[PDB]
Amino acid sequence: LPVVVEAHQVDTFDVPGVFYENHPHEPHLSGMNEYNQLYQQSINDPDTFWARMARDLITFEKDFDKTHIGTLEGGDNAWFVGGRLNASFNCVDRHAMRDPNKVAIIYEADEPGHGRSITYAELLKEVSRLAWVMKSQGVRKGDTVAIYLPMIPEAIFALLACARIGAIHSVVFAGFSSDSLRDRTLDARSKFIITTDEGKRGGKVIGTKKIVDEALKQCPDVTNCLVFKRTGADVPWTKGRDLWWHEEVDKYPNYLPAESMDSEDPLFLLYTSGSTGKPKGVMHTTAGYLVGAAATGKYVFDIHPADRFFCGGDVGWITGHTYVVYAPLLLGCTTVVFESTPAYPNFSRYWDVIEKHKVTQFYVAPTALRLLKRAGDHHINHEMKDLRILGSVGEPIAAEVWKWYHEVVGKRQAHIVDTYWQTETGSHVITPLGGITPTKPGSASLPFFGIDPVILDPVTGAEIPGNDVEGILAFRKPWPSMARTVWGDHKRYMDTYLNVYKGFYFTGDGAGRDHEGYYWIRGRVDDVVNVSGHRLSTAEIEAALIEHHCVAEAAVVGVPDPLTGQAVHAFVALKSGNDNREQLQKELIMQVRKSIGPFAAPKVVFVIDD
Numbered sequence: 001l002p003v004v005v006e007a008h009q010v011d012t013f014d015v016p017g018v019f020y021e022n023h024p025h026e027p028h029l030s031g032m033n034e035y036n037q038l039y040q041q042s043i044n045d046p047d048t049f050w051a052r053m054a055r056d057l058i059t060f061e062k063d064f065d066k067t068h069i070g071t072l073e074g075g076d077n078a079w080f081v082g083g084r085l086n087a088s089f090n091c092v093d094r095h096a097m098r099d100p101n102k103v104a105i106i107y108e109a110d111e112p113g114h115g116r117s118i119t120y121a122e123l124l125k126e127v128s129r130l131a132w133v134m135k136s137q138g139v140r141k142g143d144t145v146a147i148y149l150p151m152i153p154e155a156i157f158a159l160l161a162c163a164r165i166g167a168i169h170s171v172v173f174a175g176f177s178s179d180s181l182r183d184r185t186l187d188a189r190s191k192f193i194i195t196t197d198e199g200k201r202g203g204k205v206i207g208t209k210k211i212v213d214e215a216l217k218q219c220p221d222v223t224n225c226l227v228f229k230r231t232g233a234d235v236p237w238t239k240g241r242d243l244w245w246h247e248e249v250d251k252y253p254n255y256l257p258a259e260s261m262d263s264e265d266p267l268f269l270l271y272t273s274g275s276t277g278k279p280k281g282v283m284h285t286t287a288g289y290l291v292g293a294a295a296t297g298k299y300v301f302d303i304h305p306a307d308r309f310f311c312g313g314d315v316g317w318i319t320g321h322t323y324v325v326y327a328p329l330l331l332g333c334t335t336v337v338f339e340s341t342p343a344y345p346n347f348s349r350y351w352d353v354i355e356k357h358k359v360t361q362f363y364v365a366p367t368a369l370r371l372l373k374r375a376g377d378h379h380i381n382h383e384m385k386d387l388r389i390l391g392s393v394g395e396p397i398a399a400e401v402w403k404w405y406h407e408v409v410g411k412r413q414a415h416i417v418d419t420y421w422q423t424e425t426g427s428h429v430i431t432p433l434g435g436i437t438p439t440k441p442g443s444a445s446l447p448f449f450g451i452d453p454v455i456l457d458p459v460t461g462a463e464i465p466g467n468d469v470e471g472i473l474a475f476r477k478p479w480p481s482m483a484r485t486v487w488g489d490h491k492r493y494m495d496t497y498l499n500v501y502k503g504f505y506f507t508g509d510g511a512g513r514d515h516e517g518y519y520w521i522r523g524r525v526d527d528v529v530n531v532s533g534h535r536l537s538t539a540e541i542e543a544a545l546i547e548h549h550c551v552a553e554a555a556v557v558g559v560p561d562p563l564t565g566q567a568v569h570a571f572v573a574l575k576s577g578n579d580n581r582e583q584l585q586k587e588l589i590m591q592v593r594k595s596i597g598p599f600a601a602p603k604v605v606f607v608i609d610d
């Protein structure tokens with residue numbers, strides 16, 4: 001009967017009472033009244049609200065002159081202008097100064113019972129001497145550095161060492177093919193790459209150095225490749241280009257100065273798939289991105305310095321950027337770097353890790369939850385006494401999965417926080433606040449501070465006022481962690497995000513706002529599909545399928561899937577005939593695996609006449 005049909009007869013759920021009784025500290029907010037007061041200030045007077053938030057959470061070398069200049073339509077937004085700071089100083093130095101022996105990183109290795117814990121002082125040493133390696137090899141402020149690493153603590157060392165010297169890290173998910181790594185390394189114009197000899201995940205060997213070698217044959221500007229010895233396997237070696245991480249860092253001091261950066265110096269590039277064209281290098285700058293990361297870590301995930309935060313996302317994606325690395329380290333707590341899968345050695349692994357390390361917040365994709373729920377509740381039998389926040393990201397956590405997460409995983413003692421955001425927003429933008437916001441199963445709830453959502457008519461672009469409305473999700477105002485450009489193509493950034501509905505930021509998602517103002521995310525309205533947590537471009541996959549000599553035309557679509565959220569399905573029209581039609585279906589799948597990576601392979605390729 002309502003316009004937003006998903007909300008029909010869905011009541012809110014309060015934060016469990018025991019959450020407050022068992023809390024080691026207390027929430028950073030007194031309740032929803034204070035959220036509403038701070039939220040209104042963040043919209044009505046963002047100059048005052050964000051200046052105080054930034055000065056609360058981020059240590060500047062030089063205080064900023066003005067909170068924000070520019071406009072959405074101008075595509076000229078700048079935050080904390082005139083400030084100077086360094087991201088590695090805020091993630092590492094200031095904490096090592098105060099509490100050097102506090103654990104910063106818990107490394108959980110692919111095999112249980114391995115791994116190690118890393119203090120803030122140890123982190124400062126490893127970041128410093130890795131930064132010395134890059135500096136000695138000629139990396140300078142403003143250079144991009146390609147990173148092709150699995151989930152080991154050396155990945156955090158690498159991001160933060162780039163930030164320490166003002167280089168711009170460009171992390172490439174270690175499941176990408178050599179073609180995909182090559183394309184991102186070329187576009188970023190990186191001259192330095194960091195990788196492993198091999199990766200280990202779920203007991204399986206990933207031949208990272210071999211993949212890198214293949215990519216670098218076509219990246220002539222890459223003059224050094226720093227290799228971390230993860231497995232010790234014999235790998236191909238290029239004298240004069242390749243260097244061993246362990247050999248190089250032993251040469252250099254255990255401390256390096258931090259480079260003084262402008263608030264608006266680029267911090268990183270993250271190549272992201274869009275509705276049209278090759279992946280775009282989404283650029284985040286420094287102060288605004290860090291402010292958003294710290295602000296959401298604090299108020300969304302209820303992070304306090306003593307906490308042990310565990311995000312299951314990969315450093316290759318924005319979730320790992322913001323919530324494995326930047327947010328928890330900015331706030332000075334402990335973060336978990338998890339090398340394995342939730343199924344290795346068995347389906348208990350996530351809970352084994354949470355129980356061993358006394359994790360307080362866990363951040364998961366619903367695809368992983370559905371896999372585990374299907375495996376059966378006998379794999380979950382873990383006290384997990386400290387687990388009080390259960391975050392979810394990537395798609396709506398639907399009622400059946402929500403209930404399982406709340407009751408079986410959380411024992412009705414944790415607050416489930418469904419966080420809506422995207423690579424381009426830097427940090428959470430519509431989400432409940434942990435320990436504060438009442439929630440609805442399947443809803444992202446309410447906007448974060450500084451986020452002013454509107455629902456637009458898809459055709460006319462007109463704003464649809466009031467509640468129980470549906471349409472396009474857009475934001476009316478800039479926010480600190482917004483992506484600042486697409487690398488090398490500001491015009492595409494303008495045309496993609498800011499020129500579609502002038503005066504607004506276009507998310508590419510549909511949404512409903514229900515009778516109580518709660519937001520229900522409908523998903524992408526463009527040709528972007530989200531498959532097992534992977535943001536994929538159907539146009540990219542079609543182009544991959546066309547690379548096959550038999551295929552003339554290709555069409556790929558995303559369809560609902562009970563486990564992967566959505567499944568990509570591909571249709572091809574052949575140029576002639578193929579008596580090995582079942583055999584062609586294998587070559588087409590391998591073609592996508594070569595062009596993009598295993599994770600992008602279509603479930604099936606249908607060969608049709610027209």
Ligand SMILES: CCCOP(=O)(O)OC[C@H]1O[C@@H](n2cnc3c(N)ncnc32)[C@H](O)[C@@H]1O
Pocket residue numbers: 272318319392393394395396397418419420421422423424444507508509521523524530534535
């Ligand atoms: C933030 C990690 C993933 O970042 P990406 O840039 O890869 O993907 C962003 C997209 O994921 C979906 N999405 C993300 N979170 C949610 C969410 N909580 N509910 C519904 N859809 C969601 C929305 O369609 C969005 O445009």
